């Protein structure tokens, strides 16, 4: 059932998602992540939670764009760790395949 007030990552009905981490929400705003990402595709759903944020583009291609673009941006003087909510950058070293 539809649940209000939450922010998790569960497969329900989505594809185009971007997990904006290391987001200095203490300085960065939503419009900053909504506008900065507005160049990587139209945002249908964007949220920022003290610690991280989530962006939802109209299409994946767009999202993946930012995830590739945004990710590595110096916001507030600090880099932003973003990644598509699908493939977690867990354990770098190793045979990454699949």
UniProtKB/Swiss-Prot annotation:
Subcellular location field: Nucleus
Sorted UniProt keywords: Acetylation, Coiled coil, Disease variant, Intellectual disability, Isopeptide bond, mRNA processing, mRNA splicing, Nucleus, Phosphoprotein, Ribonucleoprotein, RNA-binding, Spliceosome, Ubl conjugation
Gene Ontology cellular component annotations, sorted alphabetically: actin cytoskeleton; catalytic step 2 spliceosome; chromatin; cytosol; extracellular exosome; extracellular region; membrane; nucleoplasm
Entry's Gene Ontology BP terms: 3'-UTR-mediated mRNA stabilization; chromatin remodeling; mRNA splicing, via spliceosome; negative regulation of telomere maintenance via telomerase; osteoblast differentiation; RNA splicing
Post-translational modification: Sumoylated. Sumoylation reduces affinity for mRNA.
Main location class: nucleus
Effect of residue 64 to W: In MRD74; uncertain significance
Positions bearing the Glycyl lysine isopeptide (Lys-Gly) (interchain with G-Cter in SUMO2) cross-link: 8, 50, 89
GO molecular function: identical protein binding; mRNA 3'-UTR binding; N6-methyladenosine-containing RNA reader activity; nucleosomal DNA binding; poly(U) RNA binding; RNA binding; telomerase RNA binding
Residue span(s) of domain RRM: 16-87
Signal peptide: none
The protein's assembly and partners: Tetramer composed of 3 copies of isoform C1 and 1 copy of isoform C2. Assembly of 3 tetramers with bound pre-mRNA gives rise to a 19S complex that interacts with HNRNPA2B1 tetramers. Component of the 40S hnRNP particle. Identified in the spliceosome C complex. Interacts with IGF2BP1. Interacts with DHX9; this interaction is direct, enhanced probably by their concomitant binding to RNA and mediates the attachment to actin filaments. Interacts with PPIA/CYPA. Interacts with YWHAE.
Described function: Binds pre-mRNA and nucleates the assembly of 40S hnRNP particles. Interacts with poly-U tracts in the 3'-UTR or 5'-UTR of mRNA and modulates the stability and the level of translation of bound mRNA molecules. Single HNRNPC tetramers bind 230-240 nucleotides. Trimers of HNRNPC tetramers bind 700 nucleotides. May play a role in the early steps of spliceosome assembly and pre-mRNA splicing.
Record family assignment: Belongs to the RRM HNRPC family. RALY subfamily.
Disease implication from the record: Intellectual developmental disorder, autosomal dominant 74: An autosomal dominant disorder characterized by global developmental delay, including delay of motor skills and speech delay, intellectual disability, behavioral abnormalities, and subtle facial dysmorphology.
Annotated protein name in UniProt: Heterogeneous nuclear ribonucleoproteins C1/C2
Gene name in the database record: HNRNPC
């Amino acid at each position: 059932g539809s649940s209000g007030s939450s922010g998790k990552t569960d497969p329900r009905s989505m594809n185009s998602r971007v997990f904006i981490g290391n987001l200095n929400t203490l300085v960065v705003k939503k419009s900053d992540v909504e506008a900065i990402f507005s160049k990587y595709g139209k945002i249908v759903g964007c949220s920022v939670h003290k610690g991280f944020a989530f962006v939802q583009y109209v299409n994946e291609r767009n999202a993946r764009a930012a995830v590739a673009g945004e990710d590595g941006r110096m916001i507030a003087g600090q880099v932003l760790d973003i990644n598509l909510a699908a493939e977690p950058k867990v354990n770098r070293s190793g045979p990454s395949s699949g």
